[PDB]
From a paper:
The transporter P-glycoprotein (P-gp; ABCB1; EC 3.6.3.44) is expressed in the intestines, liver, kidney and blood–brain barrier, and affects the bioavailability, pharmacokinetics and efficacy of drugs. P-gp belongs to a superfamily of ATP-binding cassette (ABC) transporters found throughout all kingdoms of life. The transporter consists of two pseudosymmetric halves encoded into a single polypeptide. Each half is formed by six transmembrane helices (TMs) and one cytosolic nucleotide-binding domain (NBD) along with interconnecting loops and short helices.
Here, we report higher resolution (3.4–3.8 Å) structures of P-gp bound to a series of rationally engineered selenium-labelled cyclopeptide compounds that were designed to probe the ligand-binding pocket of P-gp. The R groups of this series were systematically varied to generate alanine-, valine-, leucine- and phenylalanine-derived compounds (QZ-Ala, QZ-Val, QZ-Leu and QZ-Phe, respectively) of increasing R-group size and hydrophobicity. All four compounds also prevented P-gp-mediated export of the anticancer drug colchicine and sensitized CR1R12 cells in a dose-dependent manner. Fitting the data to the Hill equation gave Hill coefficients of >1 in each case, suggesting positive cooperativity for their binding to at least two sites. In previous structures of apo mouse P-gp, and also for ligands pertaining to subset B, TM4 adopts a mostly straight-helical conformation characterized by weaker electron density, indicative of regional flexibility. Here, we only demonstrate two distinct changes in TM4 (kinked or straight helical) caused by two different subsets of ligands. In doing so, we reveal how drug substrates (i) may enter the transporter, (ii) bind at multiple, shared yet discrete sites in the transmembrane domain (TMD) and (iii) might transmit this information to the NBDs to stimulate ATP hydrolysis. Together, these new structures provide snapshots of how structurally similar ligands, differing only in side-chain R-group size, can bind prior to drug efflux.
Author numbering:
A (entry chain B), C (entry chain C): 1 to 6
B (entry chain A): 30 to 626, 689 to 1278
């Protein structure tokens, strides 16, 4: 969700 | 730069405001703390699945037994956690609303007061204060700076404290859950901050460089499009296009270089982020294997600290917001705190009754606030008796008006005193003083509202009866009554523009309603038509007789009846007395008496860059691979924690976490290749078409004829701007944005495929939630702009009445009724105020709704992820994967909404750029058609020509003009005035085709002739020749294009033009640069060069257009010598304004109203007695007179 | 609301 993928 | 104390800025906030700010910042800090607590629980969830994940896989013996304890643990735990999340949601909802609403309320409430107080302060200023300041800047300062202050004290503070709270809270939780990972996550922070710095330093430097490249081409473009007629005449279009093309050729190279570097930088930054991010997590795992940290704790501290870390970067902008606001508030408050000497909003001083109006000026020295530079009034003495009327007269300096200026106490005198009746003027109240004095000014002004209201600006309390009597006593009743709407008719700058005398009469009526004891008339009769002057003079005389009066004007018709006349010299009063006395005095008065006796949305734009089939497929394939690479970052992170949660026996774990953490980076490095690619392919593709477009735009701009360049709609600047912008804009739409969109749809696509195939209905659920919060995010921004636009429209009205008030201010102070504009301004503001109250109500709801929806969504996530899904054989590791994948698909989709306006702007900009190309002229220089005659000898036939300029089809320049000139003889052209003389030269160049009639040269009609070949045979020389920046030899070689001119040839031409004195004298000689870049020359040299390029072409027709126009002394002589030597071997048409130099001409032709009036040799026109004789006599009388 | 800031 930050900036990779979570 | 100057700032304001934090406390003084808020001085208008009290009671409820401070309360709102307190509860607001409180709720903000709560809202802030809310998020990192969310990540705290998230570690507790992992621990729950971790405890069961280990034990579930640790059995490998019993099955059913694991269906009891595990499911119960998950039951209670997941229910607890879900309950908590649901708990957080309501909290963030409430506190969000409280925060934004309260802060916006406070902001509005304050800014209202700021505006009112500020305008009041503006109005309260003395005139001396205005004299030194720009009103426009002041009004714009009002409207803009108050808005800055608004932005400063607004919800931005709440956001700031909230961010600081997430920062502290995040680092608090981070530290308390453990020190090591936090310090390790702090260890990377300098490395990240540096990578962002390299990101910044490159932009500031290269953005300037990018502007510099087009400034070199733009120079060519500008000088060319400035020289358009010259380049058209000499037909050097291909050359200019070539130069511009070369400059573009350089520009694109610089562009692709910048693209390469930028892409490399971005890629490297992304790599560092990937590397550090993965590294910290690897260390995390290394700490979990040691059983030093729980697997969930790692996540908690990790995310909490990174949150806390970014919070700073997210916080910083709100500092600058509050910072700017103080700076803006400084100059604003400066005027509000400023207390003047004069006031006039004050209630103080005496208000005398039964004023007889005995006025005296005693020893008054004064200067306006130009101060020591000039002192206009040196001493003074004047009296005017009660009921009398004094008239002031003077030659210049307008010291006359100064007395009227001082009598209103607009300024206090330097030394001396103005005394109304017995009392000093300064002892009596200002407002009352202004009210007992009526004023009529040279230029009258009418505020925009009904006539009655303008008459009502004399006194607020009045009835239409008094208005009627007032205008009737001013004899303005008739003229206005004849007008429609009666008293309700409109006046102002906009609409119903009336005669000056009428406006003056209305002004006198307005002044007459004032029923003043004192009357001041300054040049009210002056600057007006003589007929209405008497009409208004009647009023002016009727306005007196109840009053004492001081009158000033240039009209000595109105002075005679004055009781006393007063002359001034150098600020010194000299002559005073009745008319006969002053005429007997034979002084200044007598002296003056004797003296005066379109959208375009197409793939057509893309069809142009279809020139490159490759460079796109590469970027898209690469960006789709990147789009397929993006969710892979999630799949690992899922299985990293997934396998670690699903681990079971520990022995195999530490070996796997090393295989993922490796791979975790492997997708990183490969991201460098793909990111750099799709940026580079799209970049290089961007710079090339920018060359193609601008090359195609510029080219077609040289196709258009003079008709299009004369248009007021198209000017050099506007053309260069239109040239730069559109080409700059289309690049953005075909550029990175598209690649990112494809990357994001590919991202969400691969993500949703994986998510959908893994989670059954786990993903289908999210896909119900996510598009809603995204769309809920977009609709919020739509309401924000809607309320923004509507608010701009309402304050636009209040700022309009402000501009009206402070622009005409020197008048309103004279009429007082500033309180009127105060009240009107307030009433105008009242509507935006109630609007700002609703704004806070809305801003809070839309914000909290979008926050709550994201927290509630996060609840449904793990709730469905747990329970129904986890009670089934479906697993946690997949849940964690799906959330990641989907939510990132969403955050990637957000960039679709963010990038929306670029295509629109680029569409509007791509609209013009196709139209400008597809536009065709009447006369195109490019056509290869036309005769190209073989015969050298030129004649010229003008027959019955009628011409009106396309720009001004009102007054015709040429009507039925008819000329003829044989070869090798000069045609002199004389005219009363106008472009008629030049229009011949313009038409022979065929800049225009005439409305009716026709023109021939060899007997062929030029209309059917080849334009280029036609223009190639002409020797045009203008008034002020423009020379492009380049070697003078290149300026001379410009005379002949399609072929390179020899040195000895431009030498011969330079010899024929007598410029050789200069060229051999210069250090660089023929290589010297001219055009103001490298050298400066006077008009003579420039003209001689123009002659050189004219006759290097070896034309059969020389055209000299007022060549000697700007010139002097011997320069005219030598240039005329050159021009004279230039002709006599060729056909020629000379319109020059020196008729002494036309005395030798084969044919002289007098133009009249477009028709040839007189024509013949000099001695024939001289034998005749008529226009030409007068033309010669008048200017010939000058040379004889100069002796 | 994951890990950047939303």
């Amino acid at each position: 969700x930050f900036x990779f993928x979570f | 730069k100057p700032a304001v104390s934090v406390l003084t800025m808020f001085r208008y906030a009290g009671w409820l405001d401070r309360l709102y700010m307190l509860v607001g910042t409180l709720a903000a800090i709560i809202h802030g703390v809310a998020l990192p607590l969310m990540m705290l629980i998230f570690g507790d969830m992992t621990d729950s699945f971790a405890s069961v994940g280990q034990v579930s896989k640790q059995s490998t013996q019993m099955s059913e037994a694991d269906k009891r304890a595990m499911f119960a643990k998950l039951e209670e735990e997941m229910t607890t956690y879900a309950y908590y999340y649901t708990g957080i949601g309501a909290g963030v909802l409430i506190v969000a609303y409280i925060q934004v609403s309260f802060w916006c309320l406070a902001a509005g409430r304050q800014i209202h007061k700021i505006r009112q107080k500020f305008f009041h302060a503006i109005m309260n200023q003395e005139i001396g204060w205005f004299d030194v300041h720009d009103v426009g800047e002041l009004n714009t300062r009002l409207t803009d700076d108050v808005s800055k202050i608004n932005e400063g004290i607004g919800d931005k503070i709440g956001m700031f404290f909230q961010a600081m709270a997430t920062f502290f809270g995040g680092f608090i939780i981070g530290f308390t859950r453990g020190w090591k990972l936090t310090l390790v996550i702090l260890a990377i922070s300098p490395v990240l901050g540096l990578s962002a710095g390299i990101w910044a330093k490159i932009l500031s430097s290269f953005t300037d460089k990018e502007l510099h490249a087009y400034a070199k081409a733009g120079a060519v473009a500008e000088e060319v499009l400035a020289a358009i007629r010259t380049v058209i005449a000499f037909g050097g279009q291909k050359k200019e296009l070539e130069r511009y093309n070369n400059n573009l050729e350089e520009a694109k190279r610089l562009g692709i270089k910048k693209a390469i570097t930028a892409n490399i930088s971005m890629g490297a930054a992304f790599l560092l982020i990937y590397a550090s991010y993965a590294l910290a997590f690897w260390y995390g795992t290394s700490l979990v294997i040691s059983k030093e940290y729980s697997i969930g704790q790692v996540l908690t501290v990790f995310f909490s600290v990174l949150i806390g870390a970014f919070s700073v970067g997210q916080a910083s902008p709100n500092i600058e917001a509050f910072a700017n606001a103080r700076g803006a508030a400084y100059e604003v408050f400066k005027i509000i705190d400023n207390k003047p000497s004069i006031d006039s909003f004050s209630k103080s001083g005496h208000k005398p009754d039964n004023i007889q109006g005995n006025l005296e000026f005693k020893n008054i020295h004064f200067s306006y606030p130009s101060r020591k530079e000039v002192q206009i009034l040196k001493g003074l003495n004047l009296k005017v008796k009660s009921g009398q009327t004094v008239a002031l007269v003077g030659n210049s300096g307008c010291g006359k008006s100064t007395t009227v200026q001082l009598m209103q106490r607009l300024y206090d005198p330097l030394d001396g005193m103005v005394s109304i009746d017995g009392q000093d003027i300064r002892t009596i109240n200002v407002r009352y003083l202004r009210e007992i004095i009526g004023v009529v000014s040279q230029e009258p002004v009418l505020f925009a509202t009904t006539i009655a209201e303008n008459i009502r600006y004399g006194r607020e309390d009045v009835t239409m009866d008094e208005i009627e009597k007032a205008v009737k006593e001013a004899n303005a009743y008739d003229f206005i009554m004849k007008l429609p709407h009666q008293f309700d008719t409109l006046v102002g700058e906009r609409g119903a523009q009336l005669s000056g005398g009428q406006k003056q009469r209305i002004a006198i009526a307005r002044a007459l309603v004032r029923n003043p004891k004192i009357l001041l008339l300054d040049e009210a009769t002056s600057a007006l038509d003589t007929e209405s002057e008497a009409v208004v003079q009647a009023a002016l005389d009727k306005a007196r007789e109840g009053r004492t009066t001081i009158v000033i004007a240039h009209r000595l018709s109105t002075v005679r009846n004055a009781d006393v006349i007063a002359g001034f010299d150098g600020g010194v009063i000299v002559e005073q007395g009745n008319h006969d006395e002053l005429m007997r005095e034979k002084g200044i008065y007598f002296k003056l008496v004797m003296t005066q006796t379109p959208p375009a949305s197409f793939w057509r734009i893309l069809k142009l860059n279809s020139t490159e089939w490759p460079y796109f497929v590469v970027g898209i394939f690469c960006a789709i691979i990147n789009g397929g690479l993006q969710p892979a970052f999630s799949v690992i992170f899922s299985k990293v924690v997934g396998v670690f949660t699903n681990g079971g026996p520990p022995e195999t774990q530490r070996q796997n976490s090393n295989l993922f953490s490796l791979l975790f980076l492997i997708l990183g490095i490969i991201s460098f290749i793909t990111f750099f690619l799709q940026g580079f392919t799209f970049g290089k593709a961007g710079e090339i078409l920018t060359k193609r477009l601008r090359y195609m735009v510029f080219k077609s701009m040289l196709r258009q004829d003079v008709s299009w360049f004369d248009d007021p709609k198209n000017t050099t600047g506007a053309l260069t701007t239109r040239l730069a912008n559109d080409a700059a804009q289309v690049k953005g739409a075909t550029g990175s944005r598209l690649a990112v969109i494809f990357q994001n749809i590919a991202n969400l696509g691969t993500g949703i495929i994986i998510s959908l195939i893994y989670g059954w209905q786990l993903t289908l659920l999210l896909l119900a939630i996510v598009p809603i919060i995204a769309i809920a995010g977009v609709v919020e921004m739509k309401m924000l702009s809607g309320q923004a636009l509507k608010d701009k429209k309402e304050l636009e009205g209040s700022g309009k009445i402000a501009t009206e008030a402070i622009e005409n201010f020197r008048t309103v102070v004279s009429l007082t009724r500033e309180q009127k504009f105060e009240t009107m301004y307030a009433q105008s503001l009242q509507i935006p105020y109630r609007n700002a109250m609703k704004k806070a109500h809305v801003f809070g709801i839309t914000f909290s709704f979008t926050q709550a929806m994201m927290y509630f969504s996060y609840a449904a996530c793990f709730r469905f992820g747990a329970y129904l899904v986890t009670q089934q054989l479906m697993t946690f590791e997949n849940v964690l994967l799906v959330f990641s994948a989907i939510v990132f698909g969403a955050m990637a989709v957000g960039q679709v909404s963010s990038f929306a306006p670029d295509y629109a702007k680029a569409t509007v900009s791509a609209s013009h750029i196709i139209r400008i190309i597809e536009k065709t002229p009447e006369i195109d220089s490019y056509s290869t058609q036309g005769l190209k005659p073989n015969m050298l000898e030129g004649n010229v036939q003008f027959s019955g020509v009628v011409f009106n300029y396309p720009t001004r089809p009102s007054i015709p320049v040429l009507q039925g003009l008819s000329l003829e000139v044989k070869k090798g003889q000069t045609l002199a052209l004389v005219g009363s005035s106008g472009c008629g003389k030049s229009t011949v030269v313009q038409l022979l160049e065929r800049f225009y085709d005439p409305m009716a009639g026709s023109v021939f040269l060899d007997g062929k009609e030029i209309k059917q002739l080849n334009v280029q070949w036609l223009r190639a045979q002409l020797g045009i020389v203008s008034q002020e020749p423009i020379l492009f920046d380049c070697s003078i030899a290149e300026n001379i070689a410009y005379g002949d294009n399609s072929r390179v001119v020899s040195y000895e040839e431009i030498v011969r031409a330079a010899k024929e033009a007598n410029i050789h004195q200069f060229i051999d004298s210069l250090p660089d000689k023929y290589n010297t640069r001219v055009g103001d870049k490298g050298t400066q020359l006077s008009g003579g040299q420039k003209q001689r060069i123009a002659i050189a390029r004219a006759l290097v072409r070896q034309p059969h027709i020389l055209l000299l257009d007022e060549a000697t126009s700007a010139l002097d002394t011997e320069s005219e002589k030598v240039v005329q010598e050159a021009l004279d030597k230039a002709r006599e071997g060729r056909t020629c048409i000379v319109i020059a304004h020196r008729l002494s130099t036309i005395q030798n001409a084969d044919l002289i032709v007098v133009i009249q109203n477009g028709k040839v009036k007189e024509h013949g040799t000099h001695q024939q026109l001289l034998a005749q007695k008529g226009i030409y004789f007068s033309m010669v006599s008048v200017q010939a009388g000058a040379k004889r007179s100069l002796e």
